[PDB]
Design an enzyme around this catalytic site. Structure first.
Site, PDB file in Angstrom:
ATOM      1  N   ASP A  67       0.703  -1.044   0.239  1.00 49.39           N
ATOM      2  CA  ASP A  67       0.067  -0.128  -0.255  1.00 49.39           C
ATOM      3  C   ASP A  67       0.590   1.354  -0.192  1.00 49.39           C
ATOM      4  OD1 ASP A  67      -1.506  -2.783   1.569  1.00 49.39           O
ATOM      5  OD2 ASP A  67      -3.081  -0.708   2.220  1.00 49.39           O
ATOM      6  N   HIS A  69      -1.382   4.462  -0.712  1.00 53.40           N
ATOM      7  CA  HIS A  69      -2.200   5.011  -0.104  1.00 53.40           C
ATOM      8  C   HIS A  69      -1.812   7.178   0.032  1.00 53.40           C
ATOM      9  CE1 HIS A  69      -5.710   2.735   1.269  1.00 53.40           C
ATOM     10  NE2 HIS A  69      -3.946   2.304   1.895  1.00 53.40           N
ATOM     11  N   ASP A  96      -3.617  -0.472  -3.575  1.00 51.63           N
ATOM     12  CA  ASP A  96      -3.938   0.764  -2.278  1.00 51.63           C
ATOM     13  C   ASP A  96      -3.626   2.235  -2.433  1.00 51.63           C
ATOM     14  OD1 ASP A  96      -6.146  -0.716  -1.615  1.00 51.63           O
ATOM     15  OD2 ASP A  96      -6.210  -0.901   0.808  1.00 51.63           O
ATOM     16  N   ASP A  99      -6.529   7.414  -1.488  1.00 49.93           N
ATOM     17  CA  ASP A  99      -7.296   7.577  -0.628  1.00 49.93           C
ATOM     18  C   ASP A  99      -6.426   7.746   0.702  1.00 49.93           C
ATOM     19  OD1 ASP A  99     -10.560   7.285  -1.345  1.00 49.93           O
ATOM     20  OD2 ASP A  99     -10.002   5.206  -0.868  1.00 49.93           O
ATOM     21  N   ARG A 100      -6.950   8.181   1.649  1.00 51.45           N
ATOM     22  CA  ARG A 100      -6.635   8.305   3.107  1.00 51.45           C
ATOM     23  C   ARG A 100      -4.479   9.326   3.183  1.00 51.45           C
ATOM     24  NH1 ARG A 100      -9.404   5.829   7.308  1.00 51.45           N
ATOM     25  NH2 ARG A 100      -9.541   3.357   6.560  1.00 51.45           N
ATOM     26  N   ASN A 128      -8.142  -3.143  -2.384  1.00 52.50           N
ATOM     27  CA  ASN A 128      -9.390  -2.653  -1.960  1.00 52.50           C
ATOM     28  C   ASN A 128     -10.250  -1.242  -2.248  1.00 52.50           C
ATOM     29  OD1 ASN A 128      -7.978  -3.077   0.248  1.00 52.50           O
ATOM     30  ND2 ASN A 128      -9.440  -2.236   1.347  1.00 52.50           N
ATOM     31  N   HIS A 129      -9.264  -0.113  -1.929  1.00 49.55           N
ATOM     32  CA  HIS A 129      -9.318   0.931  -2.444  1.00 49.55           C
ATOM     33  C   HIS A 129      -9.556   1.912  -3.330  1.00 49.55           C
ATOM     34  CE1 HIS A 129      -9.380   2.759   2.026  1.00 49.55           C
ATOM     35  NE2 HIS A 129      -9.007   1.809   2.405  1.00 49.55           N
ATOM     36  N   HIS A 177      -3.682  -8.166  -3.274  1.00 49.19           N
ATOM     37  CA  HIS A 177      -3.873  -7.061  -2.245  1.00 49.19           C
ATOM     38  C   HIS A 177      -4.272  -7.454  -0.784  1.00 49.19           C
ATOM     39  CE1 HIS A 177      -3.941  -2.971  -0.121  1.00 49.19           C
ATOM     40  NE2 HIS A 177      -5.003  -3.627  -0.129  1.00 49.19           N
ATOM     41  N   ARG A 225     -13.536  -7.141   9.082  1.00 47.89           N
ATOM     42  CA  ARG A 225     -13.678  -5.411   8.532  1.00 47.89           C
ATOM     43  C   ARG A 225     -15.244  -5.865   8.225  1.00 47.89           C
ATOM     44  NH1 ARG A 225      -9.074  -4.194   5.786  1.00 47.89           N
ATOM     45  NH2 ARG A 225      -7.267  -5.520   6.279  1.00 47.89           N
ATOM     46  N   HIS A 252      -2.075  -4.548   2.454  1.00 50.36           N
ATOM     47  CA  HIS A 252      -3.741  -4.845   3.211  1.00 50.36           C
ATOM     48  C   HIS A 252      -3.292  -4.428   4.786  1.00 50.36           C
ATOM     49  CE1 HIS A 252      -8.050  -5.359   2.811  1.00 50.36           C
ATOM     50  NE2 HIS A 252      -8.068  -6.429   3.261  1.00 50.36           N
TER      51      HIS A 252
HETATM   52  C1  LIG Z   1      -6.834   0.873   6.758  1.00 52.13           C
HETATM   53  C2  LIG Z   1      -5.843   0.455   5.564  1.00 52.13           C
HETATM   54  C3  LIG Z   1      -7.230   0.481   4.449  1.00 52.13           C
HETATM   55  O1  LIG Z   1      -6.940   1.107   3.646  1.00 52.13           O
HETATM   56  O2  LIG Z   1      -7.707   1.428   4.364  1.00 52.13           O
HETATM   57  C4  LIG Z   1      -4.442   0.725   5.545  1.00 52.13           C
HETATM   58  C5  LIG Z   1      -3.825   0.393   6.519  1.00 52.13           C
HETATM   59  C6  LIG Z   1      -3.381  -0.301   6.695  1.00 52.13           C
HETATM   60  C7  LIG Z   1      -4.259  -0.817   5.327  1.00 52.13           C
HETATM   61  O3  LIG Z   1      -3.897   0.435   4.345  1.00 52.13           O
HETATM   62  C8  LIG Z   1      -5.347  -1.132   5.121  1.00 52.13           C
HETATM   63  C9  LIG Z   1      -6.092  -1.663   6.853  1.00 52.13           C
HETATM   64  C10 LIG Z   1      -6.257  -1.730   3.808  1.00 52.13           C
HETATM   65  O4  LIG Z   1      -7.472  -1.004   3.534  1.00 52.13           O
HETATM   66  O5  LIG Z   1      -5.694  -2.133   3.523  1.00 52.13           O
HETATM   67 MN   LIG Z   2      -5.024   0.142   2.537  1.00 46.89          MN
HETATM   68 MN   LIG Z   3      -6.731  -2.845   1.479  1.00 42.53          MN
END
Ligand SMILES: C[C@]1(C(=O)O)[C@@H]2CC[C@@H](O2)[C@@]1(C)C(=O)O
Ligand SMILES: [Mn+2]
Ligand SMILES: [Mn+2]
EC number: 3.1.3.16
Length: 315
Positions: A67, A69, A96, A99-100, A128-129, A177, A225, A252
């Site tokens: 990731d 992000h 990923d 996002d964030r 997943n993002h 992922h 989740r 992930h």
């Molecule tokens: C919180 C996270 C996110 O992507 O939302 C972010 C922090 C860990 C990992 O990346 C996570 C759990 C994921 O979805 O892959």
């Molecule tokens: Mn992530």
């Molecule tokens: Mn993820």
């Protein structure tokens, strides 16, 4: 406009170098150029199998990142530590990307640019993002609307639908992922056959690839989740045996040291967003694999400075 411009409508190494500097300096790629990158990368991705199968010759290496992000300044640090992508320095980014972090546009257009420049040596797998419901909540949609338009966001969403879901190196290492499956008996061919050009369903193999997590105990558990499952070492062992694989690499989950090796060696986590959300204080890592030795070699790194924009500023 005096920023980066495509050459004869295409990405070049000089464009990519100009783009990375332009972005470092907090400037915006012209919308027409962004649009061209998206339409061209959609075409490239739409021709790929859901399972990318890659051979690494004995003299070759590849870098696997987890990731990122939207942590653009950390992405530049990866390239500084490990070299720019090229035909002799290939990369896989394992989902990923957005996002964030609040430089998601800069991460994703840089990644897409390199995918166009080195299509056989620069690999992007969906996380997943890279989905609409996540982007609506976690910053990317807001960031694209702020820098461009809703229409540009719609195009990104369409491009994300064509990202492959997994990659297998030398028939031995499978990369995705999230992880493995909520049901036994899934094969590499099942993955090949997934019709991925969609938002993920809330169950089934496409969901699992993007969402599952390993657990240390044998069996499967309902995921905290709210979707997919946690899978134990017995699940991993059976899947590797059926598919004649050595181990899996997934991402992930944040890991304090940037990586973890679970299931006795069989389930590796790599996470490439150091000091995640400017708060977690974690190290990041990337992995090197060599054609003559596919065992993972971990390379840790720590966060670098970025401009004063808070995580989730656009969420
Ligand atoms: C919180 C996270 C996110 O992507 O939302 C972010 C922090 C860990 C990992 O990346 C996570 C759990 C994921 O979805 O892959
Ligand atoms: Mn992530
Ligand atoms: Mn993820």
């Amino acid at each position: 406009y005096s920023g980066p411009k495509l050459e004869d409508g295409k990405v070049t190494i000089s464009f990519m170098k100009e783009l990375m500097q332009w972005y470092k300096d907090q400037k915006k790629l012209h919308r027409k150029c962004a649009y061209q990158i998206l339409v061209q990368v959609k075409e490239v991705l739409s021709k790929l199998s859901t399972l990318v199968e890659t051979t690494l010759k004995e003299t070759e290496k590849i870098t696997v990142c987890g990731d990122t992000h939207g942590q653009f300044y950390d992405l530049l640090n990866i390239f500084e530590l490990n070299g720019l992508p090229s035909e002799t320095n290939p990369y896989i980014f394992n989902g990923d990307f957005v996002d964030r972090g609040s430089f998601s546009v800069e991460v994703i257009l840089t990644l897409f640019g390199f995918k166009l420049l080195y299509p056989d040596h620069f690999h992007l797998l969906r996380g997943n993002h890279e989905t609409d419901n996540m982007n609506q909540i976690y910053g990317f949609e807001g960031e694209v609307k702020a820098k461009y338009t809703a229409q540009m966001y719609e195009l990104f969403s369409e491009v994300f639908e064509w990202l492959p879901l997994a990659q297998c190196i030398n028939g031995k290492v499978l990369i995705m992922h999230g992880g493995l499956f909520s049901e036994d008996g899934v094969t590499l061919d099942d993955i090949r056959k997934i019709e991925r050009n969609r938002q993920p369903p809330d169950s089934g193999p496409m969901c699992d690839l993007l969402w599952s997590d390993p657990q240390p105990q044998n069996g499967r558990s309902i995921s905290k989740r709210g979707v997919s499952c946690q899978f134990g070492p017995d699940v991993t062992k059976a899947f590797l045996e059926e598919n004649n694989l050595d181990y899996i690499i997934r991402s992930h989950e944040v890991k304090a040291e940037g990586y973890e090796v679970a299931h006795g060696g069989r389930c590796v986590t790599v996470f490439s967003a150091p000091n995640y959300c400017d708060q977690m204080g974690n190290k990041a890592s990337y992995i090197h694999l060599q054609g003559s030795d596919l065992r993972p070699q971990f390379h840790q790194f720590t966060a670098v400075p970025h401009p004063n924009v808070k995580p989730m500023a656009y969420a």
